[model samples]
Target: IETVPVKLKPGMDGPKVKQWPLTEEKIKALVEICTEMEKEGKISKIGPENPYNTPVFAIKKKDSTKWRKLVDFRELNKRTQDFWEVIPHPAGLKKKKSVTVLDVGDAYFSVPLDEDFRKYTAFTIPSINNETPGIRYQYNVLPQGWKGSPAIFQSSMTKILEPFKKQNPDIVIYQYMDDLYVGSDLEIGQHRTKIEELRQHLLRWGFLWMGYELHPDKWTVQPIVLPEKDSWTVNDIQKLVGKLNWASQIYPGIKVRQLSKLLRGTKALTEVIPLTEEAELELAENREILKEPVHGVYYDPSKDLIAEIQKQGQGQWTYQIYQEPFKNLKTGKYARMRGAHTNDVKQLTEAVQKITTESIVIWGKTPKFKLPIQKETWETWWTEYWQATWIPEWEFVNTPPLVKLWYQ
Candidate 1:
């Protein structure tokens, strides 16, 4: 978890221990791995003449005894600057009813160290694994420790995840630095299809982990069910902010400014503020809005909205249509047609067209799939040959030539 980067302070220097007590075998394995990283330009060789110095040690996990190299930059960190980064709340992800998340690998490595900062990160390698001894090397890139590493890393992460945020406006996102979350409103059948687009986008960026999750609470406002009499504590205020934020996202019918009083004021856990009347009244307004039935048929593009055309008997294609059914809160009507499966792709398509012929909704997307090929329409694509040329037909060719000199 602590694996991240560093930005050092200028005009500061630190010293390292002469040598660490390490297992002969551990040193041997580390030297081998460091050699590969050296060749790849991750680390460059130098001498012990640097102004700042930090020590390195090998650590192994509990069960499996694999050696891992760690840098000791205690002295350097004491002299480094702190990066005051503003981390977004995880609750902000409640903005979307459906969601997907992205977590990048080695988040700190993405940032580069400036020339002035690079000198402070120098560490020496001892000859133990069967390579160089007393060899000094500095990171051409940002190194872990030096206090300011996370600040710089966090800065870059905000920038990187910003454009990705714009690329998907509706998918609720909570960027916990390099870590991210993008969610969607629940769909009926093809629920997973909508988030697949996000998967491709994140895979392009490359990361150790990526995943999807449905907002258990979904991204809609619910009624304000608070008690008539209450004294708000610091903890109460925090919980209230969480609830209000969730409600505000669910139904933004209430103005953000009027509701944001509790949002802007509840900054700390230790601080206390009285729950104002306006905040209480605002909550009541949102509750009624939440109680209202969601208008129009919302086609869940996730698992419900499925249309697949498959080749059938080498003739025309057959399409199997499946949309998940959702019901109106008040009327108890469904979002999809009951028993809507058609043997023909064209028929199914026309069937779907009539469902929302005069539509007012804007999901602003269509499902994606590999189009079915018409297999039986192969005769026109086939090429006819006038002569036999290969071994399979050549043996017959000599005998046939005597029988018939011209052939088709």
Candidate 2:
């Protein structure tokens, strides 16, 4: 049970303020994602006569062109108690012999909101289809808004992790809400039996998000090793070239650069020669390493990057929640990172994930001050002179999470 549900003015509906405009393409995409969340029960259609009038905005996603919608509940936030984020100290990091990282899925949405508070947590979205009729909706799950959401979520996470920490004295848990970091000096089995045990508990509690990938984009893995044996034999040379093309993309190399020119239709696929037994074996071996996008992913716990069966597992799941995928930038006092948590993080290897486009010149590890992000894609600030010049290579979250952008 929540210590407190979202408290609103008695018998109140929020004020009405028109949302900033959006383009046709963006609106179409926006409705699609919201409809999807509704189908999953993250949101439910609500009547239009509500008391709250929180404004919302959209932002582009990293690597992808799609945008995520966010609600700005500044009015609600003013009344709520703020939760403190856990700050890490390098000195403390040094004391630990082994570290385990925990990445909690759906950080806030996992928490159940007080039944009475559901209406106040309302937000609206138009569906491309007649899904929401007038585009009004309320979140049954903990949607972003409400200052106390953090307190409730933090309390619950502590409640969840407390028992585990108590049960295992040697493992020191360092966490900020859903994301947990554990440090220990325990000898690990092939699967770090205890670590896997904890991961199972986290999953059983329904902490992972619906579309959350174990390895969200904030990660990339090293190349996979070729199998001693092949995946399968390809009789046609066209199939062989296709296999080579895939290997090149995933392997981070020019494995088929020369082969690509040959396959560039100088010769038709049907005309290509059939593979001999030896060459077929080679093709199969290459296929074996890349069955399905395993590079830098949470595939085999025994061997993948951020392997779970290592000395210790991070994030109760496969690896540390914070890694190279999202950079840790040092501000005046804060060390922060933000970017799309999608699979595209694989391609954004060198980019720094900005917490928000207009974030206060941290000029700070996780400071309390945060700035409002850009409202429009082509807005003057869209080019991002606030921090640094723009780069198509560096991905940005079209709509950074409201929770992650807390200024309190």
Candidate 3:
């Protein structure tokens, strides 16, 4: 992988970025990590006078006290063309008896950068212990935060694993870059053999893919927790909606309509909008549903198919596939399936055509029906009315008739 140095093609020159100030503890951590990376040949000290230098900072690792050094290459990434890669949905994963997960160590570092493109990945690391002035470092390998890194790495891994995939067609592997899910129909002992087989193939190519964590046949989602009394900004609501959308795949019954009021305030990201009464109630109810773990439902081809198509707020059409008896993992019971969330007549008609070939039961407001009366029926009714008419005989009680009438 290193031999085929990745050559980045940025549309525009990388603009210089001022280094962000860091705390003493973070600077110490950054220096230590940068020093280690430099020793590993992932990065090297560069001249301070480079025009493409970028900012660097340290972010704390999840549930850890340690900090990880990251370069801010936002400007550089904007000038690069990043391609989209397909990631298989968890719902569509193959069901298997045993699962093996593999996470590659320093995944980005495994990709070497071309000499000419290395200049664009330059960043500054502030000095610690006051030994020397702040130093500039440029990546020798592909750096994180670059837009093209994931696409490049995904293609590279696909290329590396292509032959192995072909050789073992029986074994199913779902790969998302360095994170891989290896599934097999074999027993635990035989599954280990398949894992070892893959392990040997990777080792032959000088790759050491190791397991970071393993949770079989399940993905756990934490409760959606937001600050209680805080007003939400448009950006915050957008992120929450994104989170809920992912969760909806696991918990199928979460009310999507609860977001209408909140989602309407997307005029600006920074504009804060107070939640309406219904929005608040719906948000709480949705959060309550997400408070527990939902078991993963592997796609089974044998089950009765359910297709849900909808027109979203932006008028884009979308659809999802579900199986009958859609289970509520939290309640351990069959959950009621939500009907297609669409008002589009074409979608409704198409769905109807696909589901049934016989007579259709169109249920809605009936169109106004016209009267069946013809001109003959109308004249007959009028003649009957004239024959039934009776005029009371009235004598001239007051004075003589005021006028004379003529009949023709």
Candidate 4:
């Protein structure tokens, strides 16, 4: 878990060279062999060999959980240098002045490390009698060690975009590694042209652009929608609302809590609509019920005075009700009393409609360009449906036939 910094000695010509603990030549040979095999369609037919040139092992714990650890041949990653800097977003699309945000995917096992970093060694496991010496193990990469990996990868990506930057300075491209954002002025034709150029440039560099789409003429940038499986609690709602409040000027009267509530409780409701407070409250209540001790002296709902108090305090109590414990409940599971005056679906829809209307009206009055109602309607329908069905069915669906039938 710790990196042993290998500093260069005084008067050294170069910094200490940290090599991968694995045999570099062996790895190289494995890669070369795999490549050739793939070209010959030998490996490709069966699936290429482990391209990283390392063997992986799995160990099962007493609890029946499996832990996977990669075997490192070149113990070099730990000694490698890291280099983080701002890099151009990889997609090469022209950034929009205003745009909708969509989180397409996760960065799973994609952290970039130096070519020369060494793998970390694992601890030795002993037998009961200690009769046999335990096997020594090494990992492919340490979770954290080389401080420069992020920087190096970021710098490399920046270098990749340097040519494009020189060619088009006005088009903004910002990226924190794989999370890329590109923006440009509102001139659609000009922006599209610039984006095409950028896209071609990225293609030349062998990077595939995923999730391609036209940027919205005007966008209300907001926080990511929390997943239903990882549904937001009252605390999450509060945190989200607080963040939105900070940008309330841009997203005036933006109600994240109200929006989240629309979908929180009813699984079917959440599937079709956005998150709402009612849904969150329902989830919170369900979660609380689940956490209660099975054999404990459970309070009867009809007789629970605390429940009655909560019902009374519902909308009257502030967000602090969700933050603190109720009389009979544990500290953490205290339900957020739904606000009596909370915005209903109609209210929320109207609020969003007003904001959009105001934004369009303001923008329309400007000398530059005016967005028609048709355009706004098109964008809203497109983006919402696009997002709702964006994910690949294969990734999440198990019974594909059943799911297809259900949809049909």
Give one clash count per candidate, in the order shown.
24, 26, 0, 40
In model 4, where do residues sit more than 4 Å from their true spots? 1-150, 212-217, 221-408
* Decoy 1 TM-score against native: 0.36
Per-residue CA lDDT of candidate 2, range 1-408, in tens? Answer: 343545555554544544444446656765787888889888887765675555554555333354555565655554444445543232343244555444453567766677776766666554445345547777777665445554567667767776677888766555432334455565545225666777777777652221111111222333233323223222244444554554465454324443333444455434534435656455555655455443463322222121011011111111111122322222111111233233222112212223211111111022222122223432333322221111111122344442221111
Deviation of model 4 at 119, angstroms: 2.9
Compared with the true structure, what per-residue lDDT tens digits does model 1 show for residues 1-408?
232444545665555545454556646665765676678666677665675567665544222345545566656665776555644244435445555544442455555566656777777666655365566788766554434554566655556556656875665654332334556665733446645655555456533233434453422322244333355556565554455455444344744344456657436665555667787776567666756654453545443334333333222233322243222211101123323234333332332332221110113112222233243322122111101000010001112111011000
User: What are the models' TM-scores?
Assistant: 0.36, 0.42, 0.42, 0.27
Off by over 4 Å in 2: 1-3, 8-18, 23-29, 57-69, 81-111, 126-134, 167-199, 207-408
**Residues 241-286, model 3: lDDT tens digits:** 6666656766766764766667763388888878877878877888
Q: Which of the two, 1 or 3, has more lDDT?
A: 3
lDDT of 1 at 311: 35
The lDDT per prediction is 0.45, 0.43, 0.52, 0.32
- Order candidates by TM-score, high to low: 3, 2, 1, 4
Deviation from native of the Cα of residue 166 in model 4, angstroms: 2.3
* Model 3 lDDT, residue 258, Cα: 63
The TM-score of candidate 4 is: 0.27
Point to the candidate with the largest lDDT: 3
Candidate 2: worst-modelled 10 consecutive residues by lDDT: 307-316
RMSD of 2: 17.4
| Model 4 lDDT per residue over 8-60, tens place | 23443222222222233333444454444345432222112212222222222
lDDT of 2: 0.43
